[PDB]
Scaffold this motif. Structure first.
Motif, PDB file in Angstrom:
ATOM      1  N   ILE A 166      16.364  -4.114  -4.503  1.00  0.00           N
ATOM      2  CA  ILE A 166      14.011  -3.635  -3.956  1.00  0.00           C
ATOM      3  C   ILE A 166      14.249  -4.780  -3.632  1.00  0.00           C
ATOM      4  CG2 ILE A 166      12.822  -3.125  -6.091  1.00  0.00           C
ATOM      5  CD1 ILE A 166      14.007  -2.238  -8.046  1.00  0.00           C
ATOM      6  N   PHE A 172       8.131  -6.863  -1.041  1.00  0.00           N
ATOM      7  CA  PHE A 172       7.568  -6.566  -0.238  1.00  0.00           C
ATOM      8  C   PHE A 172       6.474  -7.405   0.646  1.00  0.00           C
ATOM      9  CE2 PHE A 172       4.890  -6.642  -3.589  1.00  0.00           C
ATOM     10  CZ  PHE A 172       2.904  -6.696  -3.203  1.00  0.00           C
ATOM     11  N   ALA A 185       3.997   4.004  -0.968  1.00  0.00           N
ATOM     12  CA  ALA A 185       5.230   4.338  -1.928  1.00  0.00           C
ATOM     13  C   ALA A 185       6.083   5.009  -1.811  1.00  0.00           C
ATOM     14  CB  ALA A 185       4.479   4.847  -3.101  1.00  0.00           C
ATOM     15  N   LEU A 239       9.171   3.175  -0.121  1.00  0.00           N
ATOM     16  CA  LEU A 239       9.752   2.050  -0.459  1.00  0.00           C
ATOM     17  C   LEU A 239      10.207   2.639  -2.584  1.00  0.00           C
ATOM     18  CD1 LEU A 239       6.939  -0.631   0.222  1.00  0.00           C
ATOM     19  CD2 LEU A 239       8.830   0.494   1.762  1.00  0.00           C
ATOM     20  N   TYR A 240      10.058   3.851  -2.646  1.00  0.00           N
ATOM     21  CA  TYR A 240      10.837   4.211  -3.839  1.00  0.00           C
ATOM     22  C   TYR A 240      12.174   4.020  -3.792  1.00  0.00           C
ATOM     23  CZ  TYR A 240       9.884   6.610  -8.341  1.00  0.00           C
ATOM     24  OH  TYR A 240       9.577   6.342  -9.545  1.00  0.00           O
ATOM     25  N   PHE A 263      17.493   2.422 -10.426  1.00  0.00           N
ATOM     26  CA  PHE A 263      17.092   1.533 -11.400  1.00  0.00           C
ATOM     27  C   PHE A 263      18.513   0.095 -12.457  1.00  0.00           C
ATOM     28  CE2 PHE A 263      13.268   4.161  -9.546  1.00  0.00           C
ATOM     29  CZ  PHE A 263      12.141   3.061  -9.335  1.00  0.00           C
ATOM     30  N   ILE A 307       6.939  -4.720 -10.340  1.00  0.00           N
ATOM     31  CA  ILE A 307       6.342  -4.177 -10.421  1.00  0.00           C
ATOM     32  C   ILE A 307       7.180  -2.925 -10.410  1.00  0.00           C
ATOM     33  CG2 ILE A 307       3.587  -4.571  -9.425  1.00  0.00           C
ATOM     34  CD1 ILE A 307       4.723  -2.585  -7.050  1.00  0.00           C
ATOM     35  N   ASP A 308       8.450  -2.884 -10.356  1.00  0.00           N
ATOM     36  CA  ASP A 308       9.627  -2.312 -10.196  1.00  0.00           C
ATOM     37  C   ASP A 308       9.874  -1.447 -11.691  1.00  0.00           C
ATOM     38  OD1 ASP A 308      11.561  -4.025 -11.527  1.00  0.00           O
ATOM     39  OD2 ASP A 308      11.927  -5.431  -9.195  1.00  0.00           O
ATOM     40  N   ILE A 339      -0.578  -0.835 -10.812  1.00  0.00           N
ATOM     41  CA  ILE A 339      -0.467  -1.659 -10.168  1.00  0.00           C
ATOM     42  C   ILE A 339      -1.330  -2.635  -9.923  1.00  0.00           C
ATOM     43  CG2 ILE A 339       1.609  -1.087  -9.460  1.00  0.00           C
ATOM     44  CD1 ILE A 339       0.680  -0.993  -6.438  1.00  0.00           C
ATOM     45  N   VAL A 340      -1.495  -4.524  -9.317  1.00  0.00           N
ATOM     46  CA  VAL A 340      -3.270  -4.539  -9.429  1.00  0.00           C
ATOM     47  C   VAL A 340      -2.848  -4.363  -7.517  1.00  0.00           C
ATOM     48  CG1 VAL A 340      -3.682  -7.631  -9.159  1.00  0.00           C
ATOM     49  CG2 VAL A 340      -2.339  -5.662 -11.609  1.00  0.00           C
ATOM     50  N   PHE A 341      -4.340  -4.383  -6.980  1.00  0.00           N
ATOM     51  CA  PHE A 341      -4.455  -3.906  -5.380  1.00  0.00           C
ATOM     52  C   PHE A 341      -5.374  -4.617  -5.874  1.00  0.00           C
ATOM     53  CE2 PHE A 341      -3.430   0.705  -4.033  1.00  0.00           C
ATOM     54  CZ  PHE A 341      -2.377   1.093  -4.669  1.00  0.00           C
TER      55      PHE A 341
HETATM   56  C1  LIG Z   1       8.775   2.460 -10.012  1.00  0.00           C
HETATM   57  C2  LIG Z   1       8.290   2.055  -8.692  1.00  0.00           C
HETATM   58  C3  LIG Z   1       8.220   2.931  -7.103  1.00  0.00           C
HETATM   59  C4  LIG Z   1       7.624   2.142  -6.474  1.00  0.00           C
HETATM   60  C5  LIG Z   1       7.459   3.263  -5.152  1.00  0.00           C
HETATM   61  N1  LIG Z   1       8.238   1.558  -5.921  1.00  0.00           N
HETATM   62  C6  LIG Z   1       9.096   0.536  -7.039  1.00  0.00           C
HETATM   63  S1  LIG Z   1       9.222  -1.068  -6.352  1.00  0.00           S
HETATM   64  C7  LIG Z   1       9.444  -1.804  -4.787  1.00  0.00           C
HETATM   65  C8  LIG Z   1       7.638  -2.024  -4.372  1.00  0.00           C
HETATM   66  O1  LIG Z   1       7.259  -2.718  -3.280  1.00  0.00           O
HETATM   67  N2  LIG Z   1       6.617  -0.903  -3.919  1.00  0.00           N
HETATM   68  C9  LIG Z   1       5.561  -0.831  -3.333  1.00  0.00           C
HETATM   69  N3  LIG Z   1       5.009   1.057  -3.250  1.00  0.00           N
HETATM   70  C10 LIG Z   1       4.014   0.439  -2.568  1.00  0.00           C
HETATM   71  C11 LIG Z   1       3.628  -1.180  -2.504  1.00  0.00           C
HETATM   72  C12 LIG Z   1       2.299  -1.580  -1.500  1.00  0.00           C
HETATM   73  C13 LIG Z   1       1.901  -2.058  -2.520  1.00  0.00           C
HETATM   74  C14 LIG Z   1       0.368  -1.601  -3.139  1.00  0.00           C
HETATM   75  C15 LIG Z   1      -0.600  -2.529  -3.823  1.00  0.00           C
HETATM   76  C16 LIG Z   1      -0.483  -3.667  -4.089  1.00  0.00           C
HETATM   77  C17 LIG Z   1       1.115  -3.751  -3.763  1.00  0.00           C
HETATM   78  C18 LIG Z   1       1.090  -3.640  -3.287  1.00  0.00           C
HETATM   79  S2  LIG Z   1       4.511  -2.273  -2.727  1.00  0.00           S
HETATM   80  N4  LIG Z   1       8.897   0.691  -8.153  1.00  0.00           N
END
Ligand SMILES: Cc1cc(C)nc(SCC(=O)Nc2ncc(Cc3ccccc3)s2)n1
Ligand SMILES: [Zn+2]
Length: 278
Positions: free
Chosen positions: A38, A41, A64, A67-68, A72, A98-99, A161-163
């Motif tokens: 992983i 980002f 999303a 990057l999925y 795991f 966040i993984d 997740i915290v945006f």
């Molecule tokens: C279970 C799972 C699913 C996904 C898609 N990934 C991961 S772990 C990897 C990862 O970095 N995925 C992300 N998806 C969107 C992202 C952008 C973002 C938006 C808002 C705040 C911070 C970053 S970053 N685990």
């Protein structure tokens, strides 16, 4: 005087098996999941707004999908923390990740502060509803290309997740206030301590509390441009130790000192075998 007899991994090991070390807090970042495939980002070698998201969700959910992770499978470093839990040493794990790998590795909700939230659950964004959905549900929507809507009210459903625009979870501040009165050792792993307020955690340790950094690069020192911080290398250094390298290698080295190398290998190969088999 000081709690570590020397400022090395060997000194930390000796401290951890002494009667003075009862309660370990881990602070972890993207460094602990890169060996699980992983990518971090933020890292440039690798390849956000809540207000934007709520009006145009499609790009986030496209990104999303892109990057999925393909699997795991937590790392040696994750199972190292499960080992701390099994041996009664883990007070808390504060993660920037966040993984969900901490949970797959057998850290429970009580043990964890997901400072930046997580994909593990998602919620309808309508204040009067807030229906919860599991990742299986969210994954199906991300992969099937369908923008996730609530079954109850048809509002958007957002991963927890915290945006940018959102504050850190309340749990982060409430645990911080308690845990850092109780800590004997901070294990800081795979984080450059570049993101706030998470990075401020190192300053919340008691003065005596040793702090071991396991990371590819030295981090947490005071900024000579602005300004407490980590002190590894001055004549005033008394409690901070840096082990530079991959997180899996550093935890393996520390487990080995502790006499845990066989337990950790056995745990990892068993859990990896289980995950591989579906
Ligand atoms: C279970 C799972 C699913 C996904 C898609 N990934 C991961 S772990 C990897 C990862 O970095 N995925 C992300 N998806 C969107 C992202 C952008 C973002 C938006 C808002 C705040 C911070 C970053 S970053 N685990
Ligand atoms: Zn709803």
């Amino acid at each position: 005087e000081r709690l570590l007899d020397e400022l090395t991994l060997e000194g930390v090991a000796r401290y951890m098996q002494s009667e003075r070390c009862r309660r370990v807090i881990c602070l972890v970042g993207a460094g602990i999941s890169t060996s699980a495939g992983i990518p971090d980002f933020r890292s440039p070698s690798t390849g956000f707004e809540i207000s934007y998201f709520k009006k145009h969700p499609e790009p986030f959910f496209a990104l999303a999908k892109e990057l999925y992770p393909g699997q795991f499978k937590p790392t040696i470093c994750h199972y190292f923390m499960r080992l701390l839990k099994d041996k009664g040493l883990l007070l808390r794990c504060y993660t920037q990740n966040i993984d969900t790998l901490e949970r797959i590795a057998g850290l429970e909700q009580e043990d964890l502060v997901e400072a930046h939230g997580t994909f593990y659950t998602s919620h309808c964004v309508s204040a009067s509803c807030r229906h919860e959905y599991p990742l299986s549900w969210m994954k199906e929507k991300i992969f099937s290309e369908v923008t996730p809507k609530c079954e109850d009210c048809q509002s958007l459903v957002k991963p927890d997740i915290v945006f940018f625009g959102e504050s850190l979870p309340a749990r982060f501040f409430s645990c911080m206030q308690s845990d850092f009165l109780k800590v004997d050792l901070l294990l800081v792993m795979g984080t450059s301590l570049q993101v706030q307020p998470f990075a401020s955690l190192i300053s919340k340790a008691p003065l005596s509390t040793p702090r071991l950094l396991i990371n590819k690069e030295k981090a947490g020192q005071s900024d000579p441009f602005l300004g407490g911080g980590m002190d590894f290398d001055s004549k005033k250094a008394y409690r901070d130790v840096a082990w530079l390298g991959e997180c899996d290698q550093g935890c393996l080295a520390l487990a080995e000192l502790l006499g845990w190398k066989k337990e950790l290998e056995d745990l990892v190969r068993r859990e990896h075998a289980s995950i591989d088999a579906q």
